[PDB]
Ligand binder design. Sequence first.
Ligand SMILES: C/C(O)=N/c1cccc(/N=c2/ncnc(N3CCC(OCc4ccc(OC(F)(F)F)cc4)CC3)[nH]2)c1C
Ligand SMILES: *[C@@H]1O[C@H](CO)[C@@H](O[C@@H]2O[C@H](CO)[C@@H](O)[C@H](O)[C@H]2NC(C)=O)[C@H](O)[C@H]1NC(C)=O
Ligand SMILES: *[C@@H]1O[C@H](CO)[C@@H](O[C@@H]2O[C@H](CO)[C@@H](O)[C@H](O)[C@H]2NC(C)=O)[C@H](O)[C@H]1NC(C)=O
Ligand SMILES: *[C@@H]1O[C@H](CO)[C@@H](O)[C@H](O)[C@H]1NC(C)=O
Ligand SMILES: *[C@@H]1O[C@H](CO)[C@@H](O)[C@H](O)[C@H]1NC(C)=O
Ligand SMILES: *[C@@H]1O[C@H](CO)[C@@H](O)[C@H](O)[C@H]1NC(C)=O
Ligand SMILES: *[C@@H]1O[C@H](CO)[C@@H](O)[C@H](O)[C@H]1NC(C)=O
Ligand SMILES: *[C@@H]1O[C@H](CO)[C@@H](O)[C@H](O)[C@H]1NC(C)=O
Lengths: 173, 1138, 120
Amino acid sequence: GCVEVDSETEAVYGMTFKILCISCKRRSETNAETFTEWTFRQKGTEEFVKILRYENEVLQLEEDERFEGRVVWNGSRGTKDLQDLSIFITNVTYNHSGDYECHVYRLLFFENYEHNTSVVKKIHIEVVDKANRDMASIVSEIMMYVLIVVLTIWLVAEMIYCYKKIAAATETA
Amino acid sequence: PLRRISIKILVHSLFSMLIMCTILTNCIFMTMNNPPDWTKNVEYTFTGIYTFESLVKILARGFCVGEFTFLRDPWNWLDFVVIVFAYLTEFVNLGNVSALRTFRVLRALKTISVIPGLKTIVGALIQSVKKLSDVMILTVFCLSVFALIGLQLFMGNLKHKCFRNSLENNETLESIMNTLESEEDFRKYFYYLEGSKDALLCGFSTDSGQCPEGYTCVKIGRNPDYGYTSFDTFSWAFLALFRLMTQDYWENLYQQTLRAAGKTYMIFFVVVIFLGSFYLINLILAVVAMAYEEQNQANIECSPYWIKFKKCIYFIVMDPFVDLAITICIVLNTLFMAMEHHPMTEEFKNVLAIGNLVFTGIFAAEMVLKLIAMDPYEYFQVGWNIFDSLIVTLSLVELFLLSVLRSFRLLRVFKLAKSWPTLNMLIKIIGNSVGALGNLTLVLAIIVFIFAVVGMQLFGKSYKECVCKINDDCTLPRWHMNDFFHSFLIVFRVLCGEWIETMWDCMEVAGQAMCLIVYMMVMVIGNLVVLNLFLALLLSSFSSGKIWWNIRKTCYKIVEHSWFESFIVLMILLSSGALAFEDIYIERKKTIKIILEYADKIFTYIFILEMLLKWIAYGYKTYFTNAWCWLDFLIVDVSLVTLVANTLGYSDLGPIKSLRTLRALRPLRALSRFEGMRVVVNALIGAIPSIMNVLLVCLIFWLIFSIMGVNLFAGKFYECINTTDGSRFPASQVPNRSECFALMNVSQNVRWKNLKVNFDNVGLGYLSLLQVATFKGWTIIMYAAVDSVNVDKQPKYEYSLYMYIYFVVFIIFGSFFTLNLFIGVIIDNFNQQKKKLGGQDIFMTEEQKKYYNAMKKLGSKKPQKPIPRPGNKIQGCIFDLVTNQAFDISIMVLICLNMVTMMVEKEGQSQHMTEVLYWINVVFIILFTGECVLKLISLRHYYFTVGWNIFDFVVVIISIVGMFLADLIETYFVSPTLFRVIRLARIGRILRLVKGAKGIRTLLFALMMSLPALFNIGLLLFLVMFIYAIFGMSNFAYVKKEDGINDMFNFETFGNSMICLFQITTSAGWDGLLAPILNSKPPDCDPKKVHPGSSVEGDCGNPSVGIFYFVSYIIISFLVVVNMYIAVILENFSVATE
Amino acid sequence: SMEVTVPATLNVLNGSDARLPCTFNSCYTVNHKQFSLNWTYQECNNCSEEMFLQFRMKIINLKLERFQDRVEFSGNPSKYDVSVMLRNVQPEDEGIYNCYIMNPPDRHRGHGKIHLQVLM
Ligand SMILES: C/C(O)=N/c1cccc(/N=c2/ncnc(N3CCC(OCc4ccc(OC(F)(F)F)cc4)CC3)[nH]2)c1C
Ligand SMILES: *[C@@H]1O[C@H](CO)[C@@H](O[C@@H]2O[C@H](CO)[C@@H](O)[C@H](O)[C@H]2NC(C)=O)[C@H](O)[C@H]1NC(C)=O
Ligand SMILES: *[C@@H]1O[C@H](CO)[C@@H](O[C@@H]2O[C@H](CO)[C@@H](O)[C@H](O)[C@H]2NC(C)=O)[C@H](O)[C@H]1NC(C)=O
Ligand SMILES: *[C@@H]1O[C@H](CO)[C@@H](O)[C@H](O)[C@H]1NC(C)=O
Ligand SMILES: *[C@@H]1O[C@H](CO)[C@@H](O)[C@H](O)[C@H]1NC(C)=O
Ligand SMILES: *[C@@H]1O[C@H](CO)[C@@H](O)[C@H](O)[C@H]1NC(C)=O
Ligand SMILES: *[C@@H]1O[C@H](CO)[C@@H](O)[C@H](O)[C@H]1NC(C)=O
Ligand SMILES: *[C@@H]1O[C@H](CO)[C@@H](O)[C@H](O)[C@H]1NC(C)=O
């Protein structure tokens, strides 16, 4: 089934980056109808500029040249119930640094009832030049090696301890 | 004078035979449901011969005495009631026409008196129920206690409905509820999940859920299933929990209660099933078997040219070798008929035909040869010779002459019984059924007939009066009591434990009082009495320098150190738990994802170090001559393979990705460590050879049944379902595939689809027979078989309708007999093992064994020193008033009244009733604390020396603290769930009831004694469930959701997988769970989906691994159910005798 | 026939109120659009029937001149009740009163017949 996963908040210059915005329904059997709208503010700016809106299946992009020609849809295909509004940036720049907002205008469908809900996903990314491996991964690898080392040290310690003990017991006769 | 002719015609074989034939003709006539007009005078002749028998016997016996010697035996009260009711219904009678017509049904119980022996065997039945008394008392006690638990926990929860949010015309919930009554109007305001008659339940907890976007959960309307599935009142809770105890459709109550109240009530259902349902079913079995076996053992203790031809042929038949020759011919003919299926090339078809005719020519030649060799009289002398004669005749009737014609070749296979000793045992028991306990099978047939015709006479008019309650097409349902055949089908389906789905319909159409009466009588007398006698009967019948050496020494010391062993146990637990977290929600929690990916390398390294240490410490000989070490070595090698693959890179390639899913077998390293699981594995390993023998016998039994079923139902399950609604086309238009395809290219939404568990080949036939014999999924196959017409023909509703007897025969033999045979042989093997092992139990470790011995040590024969009376005389009179039996029984009656005032609660009670019940409860609590505190004032130094006294103290304490905590909740906080779970504390006051009820305290002690072996079996079952749940989360996550798999129940996470697996442990709903897996190959699927939030593609599962997974799990669960069954039987025997 | 039960003969004093009580019983639950009830009067056995009250989505009182405004509905049909009340009965009210009930989905139509006699 669907799963809402948070986007990655660290792009890298001159590369590609897919901004995740996944907003699934409370019941997947429902025949919803969704389109999306993206608003973006750069770093150190008081605004929220609409950049690209994906309607039923057409993706038309705004007049913003900060994204003109370097962004493509990376979400659900040919469904009309999108449930996955993920945008892909090709050739990430320094101006792709700020808070994005993912508008999800999900109009559901029932027997004689048509709900109109809206969930907003806000994603903040900061572009760098070199991909910094995350401190959780680095401490996990360091702790893996530390645990391997301390375990083998405990092993060899008890090994030589018992060994010379039983050698003193062996040469008792 | 004519008194002599009366007695001399009374005592007479042909007289008894004519009355027997007359009442069998009566039983033939009682199944008409609408007898013709010419039958009134023949019913008069029936009444006349009955009254003639009656006056004959009264002339013989009484002679104007008052029918003393004729009514001193009650078996003639039956006859007298029959004749008087017949006379009063013949003359003027009241308007209850059907309710008085049905009274003539004891003309069928007259058979019990007419036929000899049946009197004695119904005497045995009524002697068995007299011992079933106490087990039924305890059954209703536990059912009511768990009904109170379920009441306090889910009162009204099944009313939760996802109600709209945007209400028009200033309407509100009440204003629309008192307005709408049609189900389409209900649908316009609630959710109503696309087809179900009842509105979907929702929940306020985060896990239960999940009301869709625009709907808010609120409890308004009627409970599901017409209002009968509910916990609102104590009556409906007792009905739903009897439903749980007999495991009748309990899977749907499971799903509904979890969806409404939360997924964390799987705890309630686990406790209810694995104590109430299992323990009580097997306690009924234990007591029935005990009474049966005790009464059973108390019972026991060209003439020359012709003779030259004869000599030549009798010499060339060469007895010791032509036997094996035609035996291998029989086996190849079996396996040659078994390769017939609906999708067939004409080459395979004519190959089968020529092979079959060649084999039957061989058979005929050999049989006639030896017949005229050894003297047709001497030939017909023998049963196997006459059987082969019959078989060759039924074969040659296919010389130049429909599949029932050919499908009587199948029973050749029994010819193997002369060489097969296990098949000899099976032949023995199958013939014994029609022989020695032909009486019991006849009593069962008579009871089923009587209940069929009673149910018909009562309810078949209402069913037709308007089905429009239980149907929207206003036609009869599948299981209706309108005809005798269908009444019998319902009684059969209630003998199998499936009473509730038909009881709902019958209640709706014809009154809850009569329907509960009839169905409860059917259910009890069949299942809990007679169909238990058969299994108890099978059970009883099967009863009867050299630095290297010091290096190895220190390595051995370190390896077998208890510290090292516990360290490896802890690491096994950690490495197995590290598998619960890798589900579809693992693209989130990336920190724990990376932590686990590195912990898996750490675990690989630790276990490789342990393997190398065990090598250096034991030697390759001692290592590779140990199955546990072999299993650990195999798992460690697979771990090292996947580790070096993922480390060297270039590794996401096919086979190694599949090897990665074998990480699910990592928990298997816990068997070697936990001796609780190890002893149950040893018991199963000891029992597996006899299992294999009887399993081959039953596989070839089912192969006979499956080849018959394939000949009957090859390709006759294809129907034109209309994909939107799921409704078979009306068969007036589109009567066949050639019209279905014209429909499919003139319209877009019709799909000529099979059933995916059918009799299309022998493998699918084995699967369908597994479903029919488990009773979980059998109904779709039964419906499609009885609708079948031909191969490429649209089915017609009950066009056959008599393949129901194929299924009835298959149940009664292949399912009923063979599963009871499994049980019998497995109990015999477990008892062989229990005797081989010095007379010790075989499911408990030795620490557990001494625990269990010191536990049963409480079965004291000695009355303990009561207590020393105090010298202070006022405390002494308090002492005697406390100790007297009057005081004891007064406390017992007060406890019963507390139980009653808990029962009286219900959903939607008024505030005045709620508060008066509050005050009755508080005064109950006050008087309970008063009695406990004054007996404490009496026995200050000696009270707490008794378990029941300390339990009384504990329950009064927990009740007072629960009610004061409800007060403090009111004052301080808000928590309804915690409020209810704290209110649950007052049930201890009623659980105090078993203090004085000895006939149930004994069985409670039996269950307590069985608890250790049950804990070992539960350890093993939980490890098997863990392995299967990890396999599920890996494979069956992302399957399409259908039947058993939905949002609440699926293998997407560990919680969902373990709840599905606990549902399957009782075999419940395994067909529904397997049905979404079994589909691939669109339009059953989309093999390249996206699944937003994960890289996985496609939303179906591999049918091979799906069938293997589910069949193997239900079989392993069956074997561990047998294990727990043996635990229950053994400990019941122990507590009874000791 | 439909389970329609009414007092075959109803004897009422001139000037008193006469409740004409009839019981209609059929399976299912009554539907307002679905449930229809008709009452007719005849001066005599062979006499033409005059409809005086109907239920069609609600009670319709036809206000026949022969009854003035003395007819009232007196029954809750959801209860299978369709009784009528004739206030201050007059001698000319003597005759035959027919209740016809057609209830969907029930195909059958119930019929009750009361002979009203006016005392003196
Ligand atoms: C035939 C039968 O039901 N004899 C009785 C009768 C009465 C009590 C009784 N004891 C019981 N105790 C506790 N729970 C239960 N139930 C739950 C399990 C049900 O079995 C499902 C099954 C699955 C796989 C199998 O193996 C496979 F796959 F078919 F080969 C065979 C069976 C039976 C009812 N029964 C037994 C065993
Ligand atoms: C399969 O069933 C659906 C409804 O369950 C049918 O759809 C209906 O079609 C008729 C004629 O086109 C429409 O007037 C209805 O409004 C439809 N109902 C719904 C609920 O959509 C469909 O026609 C059926 N299939 C075929 C081949 O007849
Ligand atoms: C399958 O069912 C169809 C539907 O009745 C049968 O109809 C045949 O073909 C057309 C249908 O448009 C009819 O006008 C013919 O009269 C039918 N044939 C005969 C011999 O009656 C058809 O016969 C059935 N069997 C098939 C197609 O094998
Ligand atoms: C995102 O776009 C790239 C090309 O721009 C494509 O290769 C990739 O498959 C897309 N991602 C998804 C999830 O479809
Ligand atoms: C990005 O675009 C710049 C020019 O705008 C170009 O020099 C560079 O090579 C591009 N890099 C990628 C990865 O597309
Ligand atoms: C990025 O933004 C800066 C100002 O913040 C602007 O000078 C520059 O032209 C922008 N880049 C592009 C490609 O337009
Ligand atoms: C309601 O639906 C309309 C289109 O039907 C859409 O423009 C609007 O954004 C929706 N509003 C909300 C709050 O979903
Ligand atoms: C339906 O008929 C058309 C021509 O009439 C044919 O081309 C097509 O293959 C048919 N479809 C099916 C499913 O038989």
